[PDB]
């Protein structure tokens, strides 16, 4: 596009009438030179910091980094703070205020005189929430991440961010650790200003963030508290300027190729598997047809090569210093799986912009030989028993599993599940499949991440620390097992896995993607033809928005209203 | 002068040797891109804020905006707090302080790699105490001045910062007020973020820095709240930038004709009389010829026309509404006062700053037949009783007094003044003289604002509150009164002020500005025979530098060694 | 101590004169409730941040978590910037302006109404200046250190602060390595926030500080960005107040035996070699008397048990998490090497706190008979050539070296070996004595960091990496070899280093602390007595000041004038 020319801040902020004075004048009150209203590019710093989301309590210093770089670049800074959601504070569950979320930054986008975009997020459902908003205006944004926690650690051993939440607590179940024990773990798991260390969602969505090409290239495996981290701040308020005056809008970033090389790379890393949901949802906003079958298909005998956990050993600063994400790229373009002129933020393709990166640490990042998988993308799984799909994280679960026919063990919702799993008369072992309902986007509500259910004590001490589950809740990016996650449709709208009944039999099978219950299809006709809601019902408030209005998690379970891309055209005058 | 060029910062930033790695690679370990270290200007803004100067309070957030204009510009930004002399926390007295401010300042400036200096400055000392450190240095410089507070107001009446304490504290004594309504006035005496607003020493210092060109037009008078100080930090965060390329030095701004455009403007505003002491030690540090005499010579017959406490009604907020220290500059070039082709900080001269302004009140810039005073400089006495001088800010005392003679009522120290006014058994009258002796640079030490001593209670029980006072302290600026001060010798060095007797007459006559003690030259001279030094000498500490190295205050009073200005080569490096 | 009593504070803000309201009236434009001057503590937390001291980038955040501290214990905080003498960026040499530092960091205790203070900490110089100027006030004073940087990294591998500055720049030399892949580095070398990740002078001085109980256990070693930096800020803030309360003075806590298991402490971490010159500094100001023969005595047959470069292998993350200092302290106490009952700041005894710590990691943290050194402790040598004294540290020194004769070529000034030390025609072997003067206090001047001079490059490609050397200088804490440094007297003010000349020889014999110029009494006795003094000795500014007053390095480089405690008494009043 042309330089100048009259961008959508100057409705605002150029020329004369009465209108104009009331804008620019009101907004002098903070000593702005006149000459910053001349329509130079006026850059919106959304921002998602907060005292009660602590992952991303250093974004404040980062904005302020973000800012000195529109300044130099010749723009005009301005910070906004937008909804955090923020992971460990949100009740019932944070995945419950993504949409609030997105809904929000979309409109403090549009209704207000900002150019252009930084979206400054890090706890898990900030990065999807307002990539979701954002791509609802198709302003030029782009996105800087807060940057993982460092290496915690116990008793002289490498503890990682929720792995070893789920570790320790079943270990307490097995006899093998005592709580107080894990309280003394504590101190030392989550020590620095950042996000998981682990692949969980926060690492999963930020490198989806720069697989996508929403951010310069290096973006996501930088710790939180490196210097480099603040560099690439600066170097992001400088870019998003000359961004504006080139209208380098998203829609021209996330092509169909950039999310299926969000998709690979997810394979390639081990990702967490709400980055199905999430760039399912994303893409929704920006207009891209993408479903389940595009992430089974891609994903397809894509080796997990980076070596963290919860599907191996290391850490995120282990991965920052072998090179990052780049260098997977790179890799992924070696092995001819990546489409690579894709465009990115920069105004390089994505090939261009890793081509020449070194692995330093074979370890950390595998030779292809030596992989956790040799087909690590997560697997859609398809059948009577979820015929909208349902998904699996193959390089955490255990291969003697992904082909599996047991006997059902079924809870009714969450508080069923407590009320029985450590029941010693439970009647369940180690080859029955445990089954919960009424824990998805509508049941729980809010799909929470509790289908990584915890084993039987009695399991637990014969030394067996995996079985097969299934639900229609999601699981932590930092959780392992075999567990089937995302059943749609969800029971909480009469989906099959509603009428479960204990004693069924149910047939996993990976390779075949396939998941069966085996009942006659009369049978299961006549029990849905029964159905009833079981869940809480909300009369009114934002629940009662969320229960009417929320889509499934096989299409990303956003709002259904809420879906596309509105524009960025300028209101009507307030006065 | 040539630009692009090696800057000094560059001795330190640029290349590619150990001792360059050393010094860069450091520095990035806060974020910085590669090529901020590439010779643009590195700009140190030096910082007087401290939770202990009140009166300062605000300058971490006009620093952001000057930060911000030097991004703008292209150069560097690094905040540098500094020593900050407060004059409300420091004692024995802010004035002690100065010289060891202006110490630091200089090696801190000259020690690091600074290009170019943005002064940060407010209250009484700091705006001294920072000039004298940037003259002795001669690195492009600049002043932002902190502001006055807003108008204070007790029982709907205007009460000032500083004139309305020595108003209400004689009135405690004359019987007219209690301590009680006192202390209700406390809350609404001092409620903005800024300096005194009377024209006291940190609204005349401001103005001082102004009148000489080393602030841009419209510095002095911006109340410290209002948004165009803001502003105006913004502006000079840009400006230092192209200084330092063009090398605009303090050396070629404060000139001798810079110097008496500060003599005559302090004049026309009625400004403190401890500008006399700073000044003298300004020009002391960028080399400048400058005398007690130029004083006297060049404030004659210049009419003192803005109308605000201590000599007239107003406070700086109405100063600043009918168009601050622009508006008196214009009226001296009006005049033929002004040296229109002295040069300012901005690249232009002060001329045509300020030719185009206009005056919006002018009962608050009084117009020439209706000024407070038709000659309105300070004025130097001499005379056996002051070899050296002192000096009286005519526009604030009294008419009738200014010519008188009476019987010598003599006070040792401070404590000897405090444990007599309030006797009633004292023989003192309204037409007596009140001497003080031992409160100058090395005597009090530090030199005290004591000089306006507080009548004795039966004179202001009879109306009166005015006597002829003598001393060699100096007086706050927003003092009032016929006090003679700075009366040089001191005692505290065996000057004559140190002999006066009880009962000795005294002349004072400010047209023939002779100040003369009526004794016969033979019993002087006898008396000063016997003179002995104080008892109880520092013998260690500042306190010892101090009491070494002081000079009267009719030079400045500065310390002897460090008087002149060392430049600003680069030292050897520390490796 | 009596609580509650009139702390000193109240001496500018209680009551109801007009003085009072005058101080507490002013400080009130900041917007502070009236109750805060009902004389609970003022707790004054001197602050050493500066955009230009890098190593100490974080402190702002460290300093609200101490104002938080305050405001929970029921103190009046109040943030106080004092000066910075940042080791990366003052030229000639940080240790120059160390005084000035401390003079201003006493009277800005003294001369504002502070009743106890916090010392915000970390770059090299700012930990002694802060404790020789709070020293000499003796008010409740307690230390914050900013932390170390994590470590470095290049090519996969770790990289020590300044260490592999050292080696790299040797190995450039020696040709094993390019000027441009030393360059590659840089950007990996600091990449946190906080000091010199060496155990060097920062990591020393920090050491010390818990060592001496100035600081509360655990405070040395944890790293800058760590949360649990914060948590002990926000503590210190809580316990300064009571400690106001209880008036637990530095006097109380720095006894003899305090600076004992200081002395100790460095033997066992192989600490810096400019431990002895600032622990001797912050004795002169409590009034401790102690020597250089205190410090060879009490480190003798101490062996160095923590493995971190110059001296060992790891950096300081790995010391932080074997345990830290605690660890080590306890480990001298079950040695019988510590007085256990001294007391700390905590108002508990050092081996109260230390008693129960684990060791998580014998590598890092060694076990006795594994120690690098068994006599780790700075030795002291004396004989004709020092007679006042010199230091080598043993357990980062050539053993076969530590017994030598050679011949000696002598550099006299940096600029000497800096043109010498290249050329292939220098007459040098690796069996010389490298002997360099005039880089003391006096001479440098400001006692430069240089005596461990980079080899000859044709001694360096033999393979060769050791030389002795000899000299007037200080080296880097970070610095290893067989280095005699703080030769006494100096040669800039006529000690006999100055009159070494080429071939002379030079015995080392460190087991018997005899350093000795092999030349006849009168020989020397004549060479002596026709030394003239360096020509150009400054005549002005802090420089001239330095020049007259700064006493040897053998007594802590003090300045004269300043040694010793001259208290806390309020001073006159500035009205
Ligand atoms: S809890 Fe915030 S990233 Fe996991
Ligand atoms: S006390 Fe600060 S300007 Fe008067
Ligand atoms: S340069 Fe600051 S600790 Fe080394
Ligand atoms: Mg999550
Ligand atoms: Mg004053
Ligand atoms: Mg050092």
Redesign the pocket.
């Known amino acids: 596009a042309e330089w100048p020319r009259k961008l959508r801040s100057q409705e605002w902020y150029g020329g004369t009438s009465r209108d104009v004075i009331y804008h620019r004048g009101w907004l002098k009150n903070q000593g702005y030179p006149h000459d910053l209203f001349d329509g130079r590019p006026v850059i919106g710093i959304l921002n998602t910091w907060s005292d009660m ?4 309590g250093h974004l404040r210093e980062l904005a302020e980094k973000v800012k000195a770089g529109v300044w130099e670049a010749g723009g005009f800074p301005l910070e906004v703070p937008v909804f955090s959601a ?3 504070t949100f009740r019932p569950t944070a995945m419950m205020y993504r949409n609030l979320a997105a809904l929000a930054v979309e409109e403090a986008i549009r209704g207000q005189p900002m150019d252009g975009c930084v979206l400054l997020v ?3 459902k900030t990065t999807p929430s307002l990539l979701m908003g954002a791509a609802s205006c198709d302003l030029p944004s782009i996105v800087v991440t807060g940057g993982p926690m460092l290496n915690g650690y116990f008793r002289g051993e490498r503890v990682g ?2 792995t070893h939440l789920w570790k320790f607590s079943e270990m307490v179940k097995a006899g093998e650790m005592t709580q107080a024990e894990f309280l003394e773990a504590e101190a030392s798991m989550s020590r620095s200003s ?3 260390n682990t692949m ?3 690492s999963t969505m930020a490198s989806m963030a720069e697989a996508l090409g929403m951010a310069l290239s290096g973006n996501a495996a930088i710790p939180g508290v490196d210097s480099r981290r603040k560099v690439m701040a600066q170097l992001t308020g400088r870019r998003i300027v000359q961004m504006v005056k080139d209208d380098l809008k998203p829609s021209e970033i996330m092509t169909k190729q950039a999310f299926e090389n969000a998709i690979r790379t997810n394979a390639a890393i081990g990702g967490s598997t709400n980055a199905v949901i999430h760039l399912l949802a994303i893409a929704g906003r920006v207009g891209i047809d993408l479903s389940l079958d595009d992430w089974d298909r891609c994903g397809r005998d894509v080796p997990t090569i980076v070596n963290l956990m919860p599907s191996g050993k290391y850490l995120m600063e282990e991965f920052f210093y072998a090179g990052g994400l780049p260098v997977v790229l790179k890799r992924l373009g070696e092995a001819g799986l990546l489409h690579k002129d894709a465009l990115t933020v920069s105004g390089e393709t994505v090939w261009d912009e890793v081509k020449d990166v070194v692995n330093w640490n074979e370890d950390v990042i595998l030779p292809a030989e030596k992989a956790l998988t040799s087909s690590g993308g997560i697997v859609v799984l398809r059948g009577n028993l979820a015929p909208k799909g349902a998904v699996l994280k193959p390089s955490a679960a255990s291969p003697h599993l992904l082909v599996h026919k047991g006997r059902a063990v079924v809870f009714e919702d969450i508080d069923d599940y407590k009320a029985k799993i450590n029941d010693d008369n439970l009647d369940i072992d180690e080859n029955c499949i445990m089954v919960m309902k009424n824990c998805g986007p509508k049941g729980y509500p809010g799909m929470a991440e509790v289908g990584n259910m915890g084993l039987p004590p009695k399991v637990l001490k014969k030394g067996i620390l995996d079985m097969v589950r299934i639900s229609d809740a999601r699981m ?1 990016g ?1 959780a392992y097992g075999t567990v089937v996650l995302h059943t749609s449709p969800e029971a909480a709208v009469g989906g099959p896995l509603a009428v479960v009944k204990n004693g069924d039999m149910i047939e996993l099978d990976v390779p075949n993607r396939r998941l069966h219950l085996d009942i006659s299809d009369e049978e299961l006709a006549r029990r849905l033809a029964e159905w009833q809601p079981n869940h809480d019902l909300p009369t009114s408030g934002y629940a009662f928005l969320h229960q009417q209005h929320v889509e499934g998690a096989d299409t990303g379970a956003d709002l259904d209203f809420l879906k596309g891309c509105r524009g960025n055209a300028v209101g009507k005058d307030s006065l």
């Open positions: 989301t602590p992952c991303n923020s992971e460990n890090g706890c898990d961010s929720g950042g996000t998981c969980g969602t926060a932590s930092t």
